Ligand binder design. Structure first.
Ligand SMILES: [K+]
Ligand SMILES: [K+]
Ligand SMILES: [K+]
Ligand SMILES: [Mg+2]
Ligand SMILES: [Mg+2]
Ligand SMILES: [Mg+2]
Ligand SMILES: [Mg+2]
Ligand SMILES: [Mg+2]
Ligand SMILES: [Mg+2]
Ligand SMILES: [Mg+2]
Ligand SMILES: [Mg+2]
Ligand SMILES: [Mg+2]
Ligand SMILES: [Mg+2]
Ligand SMILES: [Mg+2]
Ligand SMILES: [Mg+2]
Ligand SMILES: [Mg+2]
Ligand SMILES: [Mg+2]
Ligand SMILES: [Mg+2]
Ligand SMILES: [Mg+2]
Ligand SMILES: [Mg+2]
Ligand SMILES: [Mg+2]
Ligand SMILES: [Mg+2]
Ligand SMILES: [Mg+2]
Ligand SMILES: [Mg+2]
Lengths: 132, 101, 49, 565, 312, 196, 88, 171
RNA sequence: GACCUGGCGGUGCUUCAUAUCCCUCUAGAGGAGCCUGUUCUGUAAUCGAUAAACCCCGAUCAACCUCACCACCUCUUGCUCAGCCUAUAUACCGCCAUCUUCAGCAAACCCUGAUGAAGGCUACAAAGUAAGCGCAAGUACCCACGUAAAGACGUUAGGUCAAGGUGUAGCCCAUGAGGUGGCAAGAAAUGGGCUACAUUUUCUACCCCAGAAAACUACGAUAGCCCUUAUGAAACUUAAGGGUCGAAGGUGGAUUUAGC
RNA sequence: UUUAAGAACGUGUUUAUUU
């Protein structure tokens, strides 16, 4: 049987998100892409460096906002800029969110040598597409 | 903090081959011709063969940058077939989708 | 450069700014093996001689 | 594009949960975002090696670690200059002795560069990421020690030493050091003379007539040494004259006229020191009115550039003058001057911005028509400043004046969205206005739907230190607003809270309770009205009870009513 | 579940958002139809997802949310319909009405139309139906038609019939054109495999054909290929009456002929009668051949062949 | 108690407002800012598409909310002061090649990332017809033999492509220099040419 | 801005490649992927250095995510001085 | 390396082996089962080994009306925080180990005689607080299936009563 | 002793299989040579897959490197707040094979069997109602066709601890690390494939109206031997080309594969 | 009523405001 990126069915008590409920054969039919850049276009270059940056960013933000991310990130590149768009929860205090936005935006700008901006969208609880 | 020693040995190899790249280049130019005397070409055959082994570029291996896998690596992303699919199947690679036709 | 990535996030973890769920895993297991007696021996002064 | 009125300042996260509601959040949210940038710079400059790799093309110098530590470890003339460029007071001075002890010739342009570093910070280290009252200057300091060691002293030597003393409130010592300058056949610069004017007045608290003569001497010396004054030279004069509010009024204009004579354009700070001086806590304010009107005509239709550090403090004061004068046609010129070109940047920091828009908006509601006052409330708030509890009050006192009490149910919603949900003074002025007079059903039902929200705030209070307290007027108004609306059921449940908290009910609340009972024709309820007022021993109750007994009362209840008194 | 009050609040957000969307695009909120909303949502929120049901959509709540049955009992608890306890009050109230009209008839005494499909009947009745239930209802309707149904009965039966758009398998004639000299001709196109051909057929000629500027017998040495070129004209008895000038590109030897055969036939339909064009169609001269090379699969030697299988 | 989220500011917005002021530049989709009941997602059995609140699919879209027609027309109205007028004389292309017989081609590449470099940006191509040059029978015959496959007899165009040097200003100079030594050597006649 | 523009859609390009489905053995079973590259060419005409400097900056800045650009600029020049007449 | 590190849900899902071939047909003894532990329970955002105090995250932003600055706990004070974190851990853990003396029925390991409490309330405002439930028999019965084989199912017998003549049983 | 469920039956009846069971069509395999894998043997000298569901399989790839093997030598807080290709795939995640060239899995309620394991249909209707998963529907390629993709719950403790990660256990002057050099062969058997045994052929021109060749100088090696070149620091060894050589083979046993 | 057709080692697969 096929297993990649499939959430196995259960009794019906397991909540899943939209992206987590669709398998790889829906990536351009019912889903989009979580990262958007020009590396993988015909005749373009540096698709390997943009991928290592993505893998590190998804882990930096998972451990920098522990237990706060409601759904996967969305990385966006427009030339030199790097836009991180995240959906987070409302448990943490806003005082601490503003601290981490400025700490991460700055730390990552000096690491990757590019202007970095972070966009949060708070939701009360993790959105549920269906129950498996 | 690399994946394994096999990876660490290739990092060193890529570093030593970058230092002697020009020195090796200049010597081979003498050997790769029919113009200069054989006596001189014979001396350059011994000078480049006395260089350290790790300076030779053919001893470099394109491993995966995440798992250190020597085979099954896609050169454009520098990843193994197993890691590439893990990222492509989750929609983390821009433009990469499954083919059907 | 894996040194930078691993040394950076090792430092950020001691600073309290990065939470590595993977180290916490193996740090908790390595703590339960000391209570069970499976502790790493002293170098040089090992079981063999 | 233009400012978005529905939004908060760009710097904040455009998200309902992260938006600053109150004015305290607005300032505490940017201090935390500034604190994360500082925590990251600490980590970037403490572990440079992780961030040295540069992949950017073209190179970005502003995104690379800074190196604050000295690299030339040898003892030489060039090794000390590198420790003076990093502002290393302790290392440079402790290393200057070693260089001096060795006997190596030290250039005069190098020893003068050390005095500037010492005369500015006062032999103290600058502030770093991590390691008011009184006179900062000290006698036991290196500034005076090294000054004696020097074998040769030029003009700059004294010039930079006199300015370091005045900066640290060493006025008395600076004047003593200036006497030596004149003894050495030397000439000071404009900057040194500027600090000398501050020492004259601040040294002694004498009468103005003596001070004015003193100042004119330095000016006559400035022209006697071929020294030309600058804008700062004139600004200090006005800033110093502030103490003598009344007397300095006329001298001030002479200083202003003088600036115009030499073709020195007064900046925003110059006009700031004038209005503060002329402004005085007086009722007539005849002179203050005439001054400001002339200044605006001069400033009208101009674009300003930064010249003096206090140029920003102009707008905050000018608005205060218009508020004290209660002149709105003048405030439109002061604010209309703040929008031209790029003068909007001179408004100043937050605290100056919050105060500016308070005096400004509070004067709008009071003076202009209500239809225009509400267009300014949609533009400024919240995009410009977060209001204070007082502004909401003044705005409420304008709706009363315009007989537009149908907007009150909206001003209470916005107050809670700005952090005024638990402001006692505010809730005590919104209820009285709604219950002051009877209104049509449609309008009387809205005030109750808002009075039910004001009532819930009293029930849930953030401060649990003290017991829940309900103001007398509040309970008096919350209950009467249920009756007029039609919520009789809820109107009788508030009766227990009156005596529970020993709060006196007004007669108008009791007199109107009659109809509610009469419409119901339930004598039992009618007695409850009598029983409550009797507990408080109100005189209206006894006379009221007789009328109720005439209209509706059970025989058994009539006898009990008299005995209860 | 979605209540009636909830739907009513969604109707008010669409109306307001419909006025904002026109303010963005600079249109008139009054004359802003649903076609303009779909075009403006596709510019602002561009999605190329192959599934159109997964793209951003801003429609009317009456087209998004599924239709739901109204409440069937009041406060007291009595249902509103006498066939409630059947569970199919709508389906059986229909069967009761139809069977009542069949009793009255006994007492006093299609090409475009298609019977309502099952899935379309549930929407009308707002009820879940089985297959065998659908057939029973269809049997009464047909039985109703056979009898001399009255005018009022026909209107009822026409609520359960749906029109059908009957396509026409009639070739489309090309417009005859005129050149500078004044000769009449007609142009068409053919396609076989990867070969694509454009043919120009003159009304009057001496049976000359030129492919890419070369006479046909030189361009097609193989006899089979020339037989294909002759088939269109021989079938209609017009050999040696027209002059053809075509240009074929791509494909191989035999694919270019079939591509040319098709174009010549399509362009030859303008100089013949309708009955002949129909005959050309029934002979396979106007149909594009869809048989194209099939792709090879991984784990296989070819499109359909498999690797040699070893049982042990 | 717990901190509650404020209502979205879409409610305070009016219909006859100025949208460019809300979304002046490119920014992600903010449901608390966009006053539209837009939905996205594949619906479940007897369900409706997911709403904008919390939707990640709308965050993946590179929206064009900052580029409404109203803004474009308003943006370009402010950019007409930077532009210059095209010579009315040079109406067609035949008249452009009569006064400007040389055409320089150069390509620039825009790609995401911190580095803007691209080795394909150094290439420079120079095309010019030989009918616009002051050549005679001999010079023209000799010039066509030196350039080789750079000259197309069908169009009578000389094509010079330079990608030797790092920068694009150097390759431009190299191409002009190549065109110059070709023109002059073509005019020069040597003795060996007699043995044709 | 008063510029002539023509638009055409060049044919797309699809680059495919196959990979093994399993981590070990099971050669027969593989997974196929593709990257689809779609094009759109905008042919402008009769511009000046300043007009192009503005228009390009305007559209380059608003270039969306995942969209590249290849700008081919065709400049008009005049014959150099040395080319006017021969020296020999 | 930093790129070869997974998440907790992936680390625990593999270590517990809850879903495996051993779990399906009674191929694993339940005497020593591995128990999941949440490692983020008692972790605070901003706390590290070095003892740094980041204003806004670890400690209050302003102190005495003034914004704090970056400070680091002393060795003596930072060591007192690590030992105090341990006590909260062991205590928290201890509670779980502590076992309640559940009232046994006819026997220690038997199910008969054990009470289940009052039945669940009905939707239309029906409650059975006056009723008491008690188990009579718990049997493990099987049926053979084509794909899985032995299919284990539970058969339970209970009784309910109010103490006033009303009683009933079910399966 | 009597039953429930399932499985099995060289168990009955009936209807069917569509490249599938039989008959029937087309080209092949099994014979020879070569390439390549595996098994045995051999060697101081890896591991893994290994009925269907292994055998040009992990490898879209091994002259050193890769490399984990062998011999010899060398280092010890060691590139890592160490390390281990050490044992365990019968502890696991992860990614998969297989039935699947299937259509069923099943929560939650009701009812039958005297309230047993269990079972639950008849349409002119006799107790079943059913979320959800899958199928289907949709989408991709040139459509409505077809091909892909998809394909649940489970079955084979099926494959993989040597992708990486990891539980348990074990090593820590060595089961770790590094260097130099070296083995990867063939008595033998076998799987898969390539080229051939020729005349619908061979050579040349041409890319389909030609001329020659045609049985011991024919057809026929991508083999051997020699030489040269390409890559590389390194090639009797890898590849390409030339020369030389002109072998088996004369359409292939039982049996056997694929294809609408 | 209708040819023949053998065999498959032993265990283990379910609970608790400037000033
Ligand atoms: K054969
Ligand atoms: K064979
Ligand atoms: K074979
Ligand atoms: Mg498969
Ligand atoms: Mg290699
Ligand atoms: Mg084939
Ligand atoms: Mg016991
Ligand atoms: Mg082997
Ligand atoms: Mg084995
Ligand atoms: Mg095995
Ligand atoms: Mg195979
Ligand atoms: Mg080797
Ligand atoms: Mg070796
Ligand atoms: Mg080892
Ligand atoms: Mg074993
Ligand atoms: Mg297994
Ligand atoms: Mg398939
Ligand atoms: Mg399907
Ligand atoms: Mg096994
Ligand atoms: Mg021969
Ligand atoms: Mg040969
Ligand atoms: Mg060589
Ligand atoms: Mg036997
Ligand atoms: Mg047996």
């Amino acid at each position: 049987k096929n297993r990649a990126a499939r959430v196995r069915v259960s009794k019906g008590d397991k909540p899943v998100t939209y992206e987590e409920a669709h398998a790889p054969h829906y990536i351009a039919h019912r889903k989009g892409w979580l990262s958007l850049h020009t590396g993988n276009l015909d005749g373009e270059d540096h698709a390997a460096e943009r991928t290592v940056e993505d893998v590190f960013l998804r882990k930096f933000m998972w451990g920098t906002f522990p237990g706060c991310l409601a759904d996967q990130l969305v990385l966006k590149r427009r030339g030199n800029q790097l836009e991180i768009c995240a959906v987070v929860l409302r448990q943490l205090s806003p005082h601490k969110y503003y601290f981490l936005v400025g700490y991460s935006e700055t730390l990552l700008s000096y690491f990757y040598k590019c202007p970095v901006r972070l966009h949060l969208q708070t939701v009360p609880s993790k959105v549920v597409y269906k129950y498996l | 903090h690399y994946v394994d020693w096999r990876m660490w040995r290739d990092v060193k190899r890529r570093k030593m081959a970058y230092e002697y790249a020009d020195e090796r280049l200049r010597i081979n130019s003498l050997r790769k011709n029919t113009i200069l005397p054989k006596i001189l070409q014979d001396v350059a055959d011994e000078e480049i063969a006395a260089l350290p082994r790790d300076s030779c570029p053919v001893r470099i291996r394109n491993r995966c940058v995440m798992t250190s896998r020597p085979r099954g690596v896609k050169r454009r992303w520098r990843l193994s077939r197993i890691v590439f699919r893990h990222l492509a199947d989750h929609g983390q690679l821009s433009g990469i989708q499954r083919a059907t036709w | 450069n894996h040194h930078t990535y691993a040394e950076l996030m090792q430092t950020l973890r001691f600073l309290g700014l990065y939470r590595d769920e993977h180290q916490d895993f193996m740090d908790e297991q390595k703590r339960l093996k000391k209570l069970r007696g499976k502790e790493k021996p002293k170098k040089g002064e090992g079981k063999r001689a | 594009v233009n400012r978005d009125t529905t939004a908060v300042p760009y710097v904040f996260q455009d998200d309902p949960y992260l938006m600053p509601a109150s004015s305290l959040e607005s300032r505490s949210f940017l201090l935390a975002k500034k604190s994360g940038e500082n925590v990251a710079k600490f980590i970037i400059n403490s572990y440079p090696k992780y961030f040295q790799k540069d992949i950017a093309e073209p190179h970005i110098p502003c995104l690379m670690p800074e190196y604050f530590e000295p690299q030339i470890k040898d003892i030489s003339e060039a090794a000390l200059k590198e420790r003076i460029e990093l502002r290393k007071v302790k290392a440079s001075v402790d290393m200057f002795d070693q260089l001096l002890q060795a006997g190596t010739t030290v250039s005069l342009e190098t020893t003068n560069s050390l005095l500037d570093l010492l005369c500015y910070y006062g032999d103290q280290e600058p502030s770093t990421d991590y390691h008011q009252f009184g006179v900062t200057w000290r006698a036991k300091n290196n500034a005076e020690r090294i000054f004696s060691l020097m074998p040769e002293k030029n003009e700059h030597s004294y010039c930079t030493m006199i300015r370091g003393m005045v900066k640290h409130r060493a006025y008395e010592q600076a004047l003593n050091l200036y006497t030596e300058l004149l003894n050495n056949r030397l000439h000071a610069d404009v900057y040194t003379f500027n600090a000398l004017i501050e020492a004259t007045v601040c040294a002694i608290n004498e009468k103005f007539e003596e001070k004015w003569s003193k100042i004119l001497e330095l000016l006559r010396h400035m022209v006697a040494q071929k020294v030309k004054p600058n804008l700062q030279t004139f600004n200090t004069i006005l800033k110093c004259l502030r103490r003598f509010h009344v007397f300095a009024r006329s001298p001030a204009l002479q200083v202003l006229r003088e600036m115009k004579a030499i073709g020195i354009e007064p900046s925003l700070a110059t006009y700031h020191h004038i209005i503060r001086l002329f402004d005085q806590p007086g009722d007539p304010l005849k002179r203050s009115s005439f001054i400001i009107y002339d200044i605006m005509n001069e400033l009208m239709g101009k674009r300003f550039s930064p010249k003096d550090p206090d140029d920003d403090k102009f707008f905050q004061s000018a608005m205060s003058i218009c508020s004290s004068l209660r002149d709105l046609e003048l405030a439109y010129q002061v604010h209309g001057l703040l929008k031209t070109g790029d003068n909007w940047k001179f408004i100043g920091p937050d605290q100056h911005r919050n105060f500016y828009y308070s005096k400004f908006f509070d004067l709008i509601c009071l003076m202009e028509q209500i239809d225009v006052t509400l267009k300014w409330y949609e533009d400024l708030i919240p995009s410009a400043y977060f209001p204070h509890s007082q502004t909401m009050i003044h705005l409420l006192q304008a709706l009363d004046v315009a007989n537009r009490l149908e907007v009150i149910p909206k001003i209470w919603k916005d107050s809670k969205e700005y952090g005024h949900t638990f402001r006692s003074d505010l809730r005590e002025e919104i209820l009285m206005l709604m219950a002051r007079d009877k209104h049509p059903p449609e309008l009387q039902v809205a005030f109750a739907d808002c009075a039910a929200d004001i009532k819930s705030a009293y029930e849930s209070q953030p401060i649990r230190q003290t017991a829940q307290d309900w103001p007398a007027t509040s309970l008096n108004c919350i209950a009467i607003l249920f009756l007029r609306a039609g919520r009789t059921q809820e109107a009788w449940k508030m009766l227990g809270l009156f005596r529970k908290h020993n709060k006196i009910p007004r007669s108008e609340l009791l007199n109107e309770l009659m109809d509610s009972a009469k419409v119901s024709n339930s004598p039992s309820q009618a007695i409850e009205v009598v029983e409550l007022a009797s507990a408080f021993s109100l005189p209206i109750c006894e006379g009221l009870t007789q009328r109720v007994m005439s209209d509706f009362a059970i025989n058994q209840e009539q006898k009990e009513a008299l005995s209860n008194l | 579940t979605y209540t009636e009050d909830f739907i009513k609040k969604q109707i008010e957000e669409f109306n307001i958002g419909k006025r904002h969307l026109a303010n963005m695009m600079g249109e008139d909120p009054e004359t802003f139809t649903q076609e303009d909303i779909d075009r403006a949502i596709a510019y602002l929120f561009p999605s190329g997802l192959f599934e159109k049901r997964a793209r951003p959509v801003m429609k009317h709540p009456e087209q998004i949310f599924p239709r739901q049955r109204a409440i069937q009992w009041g406060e007291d608890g009595r249902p509103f319909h006498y066939l409630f306890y059947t569970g199919k009050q709508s389906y059986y109230s229909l069967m009761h009405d139809v069977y009542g009209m069949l009793l009255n008839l006994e007492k006093h005494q299609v090409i475009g139309s298609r019977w309502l499909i099952k899935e379309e009947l549930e929407e009308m009745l707002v009820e879940k139906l089985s297959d065998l239930d659908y057939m029973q209802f269809i049997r009464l309707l047909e039985k109703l038609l056979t009898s001399q149904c009255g005018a009022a009965e026909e209107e009822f039966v026409q609520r359960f019939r749906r029109s059908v758009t009957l396509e026409s398998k009639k070739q489309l004639i090309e417009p005859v054109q005129y050149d500078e000299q004044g000769m009449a001709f007609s142009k068409s196109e053919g396609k076989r495999k990867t070969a694509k051909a454009e043919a120009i057929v003159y009304k009057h000629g001496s049976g000359r054909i030129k492919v890419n500027g070369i006479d046909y017998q030189l361009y097609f040495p193989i006899t089979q290929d020339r037989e294909q070129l002759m088939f269109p004209f021989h079938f209609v008895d017009r050999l040696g009456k027209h002059d053809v000038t075509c240009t074929v590109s791509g494909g191989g030897r035999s694919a270019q002929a079939g591509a040319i055969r098709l174009a010549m036939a399509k362009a030859l339909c303008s100089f013949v009668t309708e009955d002949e064009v129909e005959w050309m169609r029934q002979a396979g001269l106007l149909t594009t051949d869809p048989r194209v090379r099939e792709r090879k699969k991984p784990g296989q030697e070819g499109a359909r062949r498999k690797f040699t299988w070893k049982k042990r | 108690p717990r901190r509650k989220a404020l209502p979205p500011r879409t409610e305070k917005m009016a219909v006859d407002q100025d949208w460019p002021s809300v979304y002046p530049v490119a920014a992600p989709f903010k449901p608390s800012a966009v006053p539209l009941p837009v939905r996205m997602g594949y619906p479940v059995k007897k369900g409706v598409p997911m709403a904008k609140e919390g939707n990640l699919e709308l965050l993946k879209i590179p929206n064009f909310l900052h580029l409404t027609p109203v803004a474009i027309k308003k943006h370009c109205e402010a950019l007409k002061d930077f532009c210059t007028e095209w010579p009315a004389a040079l109406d067609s292309d035949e008249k452009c090649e009569k006064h400007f017989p040389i055409e320089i081609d150069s390509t620039d590449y825009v790609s995401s990332g911190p580095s803007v470099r691209n080795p394909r940006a150094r290439v420079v191509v120079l095309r010019v017809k030989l009918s616009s040059l002051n050549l005679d029978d001999h010079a023209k015959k000799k010039l066509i033999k030196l350039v080789g496959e750079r000259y197309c007899k069908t169009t009578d165009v000389l094509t010079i492509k330079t990608d030797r040097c790092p920068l694009r200003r150097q390759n431009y100079d190299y191409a002009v220099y190549l065109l110059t030594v070709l023109y002059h050597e073509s005019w020069n006649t040597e003795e060996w040419e007699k043995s044709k | 801005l008063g510029i002539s523009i023509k638009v055409h859609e060049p044919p797309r390009k699809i680059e495919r490649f196959t990979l093994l489905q399993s981590v070990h053995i099971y050669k027969k079973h593989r997974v196929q992927y593709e990257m689809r590259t779609l094009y759109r060419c905008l042919e402008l005409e009769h511009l000046t250095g300043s007009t192009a400097d503005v228009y390009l900056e305007y559209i380059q800045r608003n270039l969306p995510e995942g969209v590249a650009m290849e700008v081919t600029k065709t400049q008009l020049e005049q014959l150099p001085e040395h080319i006017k007449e021969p020296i020999w | 390396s930093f790129f070869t590190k997974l998440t907790a849900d992936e680390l625990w899902k593999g270590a517990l082996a809850e879903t495996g071939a051993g779990a399906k047909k009674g191929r694993g003894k339940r005497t020593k089962k591995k128990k999941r532990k949440d490692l983020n329970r008692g972790q605070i955002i901003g706390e590290g080994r070095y003892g740094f105090l980041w204003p806004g995250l670890n400690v209050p932003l302003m102190k005495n009306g003034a914004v704090q600055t970056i400070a680091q706990r002393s060795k003596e004070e930072q060591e007192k925080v690590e030992a105090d974190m341990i006590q909260q851990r062991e205590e928290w853990d201890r509670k779980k180990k502590m076992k309640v003396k559940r009232e046994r029925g006819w026997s220690g390991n038997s199910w008969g005689g054990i009470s289940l409490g009052p039945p669940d309330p009905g939707p239309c405002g029906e409650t059975y607080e006056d009723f008491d439930t008690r188990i009579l028999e718990v049997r493990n019965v099987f049926t053979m299936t084509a794909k899985e084989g032995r299919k284990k199912s539970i058969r339970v017998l209970v009784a309910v009563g109010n103490g006033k003549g009303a009683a009933g049983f079910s399966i």
